[PDB]
Symmetry: D2
């Protein structure tokens, strides 16, 4: 009798064993959920990663910049979960920003074509994914996306921070549109986790030192501490929002960051 | 194997079976928790209300303005749950503001003695309850308080809104202090609920419910505290172990929309 | 001895005499500023509008999506104000979102190509205008952009609200970059004003529909605003921009100043 | 013809020539304002400080915890400025929290009687001063109070931070009530300034401890501020208050203006 027992959940965003989406999937399966996974581009590599999950799960290709993939997504999910079955949850764990829009590269020097690609993948696709999956979502379902607190400007995060500001805004509109079908939409703002998309912050670096400083500053501010090597608290928080225990929460951000956002040293 | 199986949780704030705390207690017991209840002033009446809960629970007297009640609270909890057993959760569901501080009474005319009493009960006591219970809380425990979004001024709520603004600030400092013991602290900001404390602020509840329901993408029912109670239990569980110092909105999404 | 006496200020975004930028320019000139204006696309029409201002001002073409326009902007400004002279203020009063992204079209139906154009013009260009003008800005100068409070989702405004959320984030990074030059960057969040850009929320409305929607919009804003709100009066917004362009807020950067009657601070 | 020429402004909160209120008063007088000053407790000492100001100003006693002082304040102001004359601005620059509630004392150890005294002086009195002065305020006037950003918990500031969170909420209600008179109400959130009130955060410090803590405070603020921060320079803060007292932000009420070098907008 797990937290997500019998729920059918779409999980995007696995690329390595460090991906936040891998741990969301792992924790969700251990909580009784039946998963459908999506992967971008390197499907054979992503299947090798998914094979280390607790349980088997169908894997569908999804490039969120590809209109055909999005137009066929609901039908392909239905083939994976069985005719007449619907999804109970959707996890958006997708982000990207070209190197010109991040790290030591100057903020003013990022060409808009690069910024627009990052905003397409990191913010607009939260709406795109919701539009594609809502037709096959049960009433009372839950859509969850991954956020990194963009309330204040930060070194290195640069245009990804801008994309997250846009994502938070998109989430409020997705909440409005999904609410008619009784579906909730929320973001989890995680503290920093050692992942690929996080390594994009260090770029062509000294890389360990920057990560150590990042983790140390975050840990010091967090009243309960912060471990960049431990994605599990973040995965659990996503599962809490996918469960039935927060049924009047939508359009919001839940902070899984050790409390670091609420303190000023 | 419930959400709160085996957890020992202190629940303050029951006065009627409409109290948000009554439904927190009901949902928590149905989720496997063992409760200790507190009550203010009318102990026999509160016990009759607590008798309507799914399961029995010891009831302790607590007036949060009474220093002696607070200083002895941990010892009395230990007597109720057994020495060596510790609390896993504490629920603050306590609020009050004199009528001069609310309603049609002009905001400028509330005397400070009345405002100060309301801030004592509604905001400062979140810190005093935490100080009183943290000595017997387990690592990984959870303190949860009840909030009403004070980000913008509202008709009628007046100084209670100010008290909630103070409570949100207090919550961040309680998170800091409780964090050393591995204990989390968070608030649940509920939409309006038909309770005694709500009634004190004001047909008028019908207009409030209508506007809140309209703005909420998933709707809002002022007569249904269960979604709020469930949200409190989510924060009392082990499923949000990196969340502290924050506000979780159980308001139908109304705070995120502008009609 | 006006508020902006002797200051050289670039003002973008005039298209008609209802434009918020027209009133920023008018009030700034009346406060002693010497302006350089920019215009997009309809240069002869915009010049005729600029002719209605209190004082003459050179007009430069600037399409913020045009890389060549941005790359030559500082040189063309220098040609207008004199080589080696510097700007004290820059006003970004530029916004656009295609009808697929705002108004009656469903939120989910906006194609990304359209959203991206709106975000380019409405949010990214705050950064590219800063990049283009900072080389000729005086230490202690001021960059100001126009915002519409995107903290909560709103009907009709849709992807323009998303773009303003991005703009607020961009503003904090522009503040970081411009701060190295001692230059401030801030946004003014205005209440609704009857302009071409704001009429985008009623695109396609027939008969009495546009007037009614505008009446409800103004009434709700006025009701929430403790000091009221008049959608036909851009002057309070223009004055607020001039306040940020002045020397009277020299420690304010990276923030949003609300010129909205206080409506954002109240919940009816 | 200064920014505040001919305006009559009440300035509370002078105790020394380091007081933020002293510099608000100095800058406002240099901008043409006619001031009425108030002081708490040490009236003879405060007069000697006021003697150091550019221009003469009447000084009235005001303990904001004293009902009689508040009830007579408008009549005593009328006596200073002439019967039937009105104030254009009111500046609240008043704050206090006992040492049990701020500095090195543990957060959990503050008795409520002490916290309540601090909230009375630091937050409630913003409402009480507005109530006392609004009867003699011009339509379109301006009330400004001093804030220290309490969005996030901070070491040492402790219950003063809670009081400022309450003050921000009080400001939104004062804006609602004052709006009926056309009067604006706003807070200026200042960065740290070396004053008596700010020294409370190091109460009891010995040897080099106070200086070390003040250096870390300034260095952290200056590092986060894109335009820097100097704790010895209250003038940018004073200017910002004067900007809000002016006629240049006439649609702004219920809000917080950050005069903090931008530090609140950045995360290192
Ligand atoms: N790691 C952190 O510090 C941190 C903190 C907060 C939020 N996040 C967010 O969590 C989410 C997951 O990132 P992660 O840290 O697990 O990194 P990751 O690199 O493991 O995951 C990013 C995922 O985005 C996917 N993606 C990229 N382009 C795509 C496209 N066109 N279509 C579909 N998928 C595409 C990648 O394939 C990858 O699976 C992202 O939104 C990220 O911004 C990360
Ligand atoms: N009902 C709503 O609309 C609403 C909205 C959001 C949040 N809240 C908050 O939820 C909490 C619970 O209130 P409610 O709506 O259930 O109303 P309620 O009247 O049922 O509960 C308030 C409780 O506070 C207790 N209390 C008062 N003074 C006390 C004191 N000195 N010591 C100890 N306890 C004392 C009362 O005895 C009562 O049990 C409050 O903090 C309230 O502000 C209520
Ligand atoms: N009017 C309102 O209700 C309101 C409220 C808050 C903020 N704003 C903002 O105020 C600013 C000015 O808009 P307005 O209301 O005065 O409307 P407007 O239509 O008068 O001005 C918009 C301006 O944007 C310019 N523009 C569009 N595309 C451009 C491009 N590629 N390059 C350069 N300029 C381009 C247009 O030419 C026009 O001059 C905008 O950012 C708008 O979003 C408006
Ligand atoms: N200095 C800072 O770092 C800083 C930063 C942000 C905001 N502030 C705020 O600025 C305001 C002015 O403080 P300051 O830093 O100039 O310090 P200060 O010690 O010079 O001023 C505090 C003033 O409060 C007055 N006061 C105390 N109790 C009073 C009472 N009962 N009645 C009337 N007045 C009373 C004192 O007499 C004194 O004049 C305060 O609200 C303070 O919290 C200060």
């Amino acid at each position: 009798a797990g937290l997500l027992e019998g729920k059918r959940i779409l999980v995007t965003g696995i690329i390595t064993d460090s991906s936040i989406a891998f741990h969301i999937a792992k924790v969700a399966q251990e909580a009784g959920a039946e998963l459908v996974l999506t992967g971008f581009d390197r499907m054979k590599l992503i299947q090798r990663i998914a094979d280390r999950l607790p349980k088997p799960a169908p894997l569908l290709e999804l490039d969120v910049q590809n209109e055909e993939h999005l137009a066929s997504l609901a039908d392909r999910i239905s083939g994976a979960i069985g005719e007449g079955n619907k999804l109970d949850g959707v996890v958006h764990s997708i982000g990207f920003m070209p190197q010109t829009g991040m790290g030591v590269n100057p903020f003013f020097d990022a060409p808009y074509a690069d910024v627009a690609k990052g905003i397409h993948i990191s913010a607009y696709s939260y709406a795109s994914l919701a539009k594609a999956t809502l037709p096959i979502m049960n009433e009372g379902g839950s859509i969850v996306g991954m956020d990194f607190d963009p309330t204040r400007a930060m070194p290195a995060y640069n245009w990804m921070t801008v994309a997250k500001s846009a994502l938070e805004s998109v989430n409020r509109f997705v909440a409005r549109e999904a609410g008619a079908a009784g579906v909730r939409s929320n973001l989890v703002a995680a503290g920093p986790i050692r992942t690929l998309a996080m390594s994009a912050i260090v770029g062509g670096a000294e890389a360990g030192k920057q990560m150590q400083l990042l983790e140390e500053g975050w840990d010091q501010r967090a009243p309960i501490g912060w471990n960049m090597k431990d994605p599990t608290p973040v995965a659990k928080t996503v599962c809490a929002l996918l469960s039935d225990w927060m049924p009047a929460t939508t359009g919001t951000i839940i902070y899984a960051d050790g409390g670091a956002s609420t303190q000023l040293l």
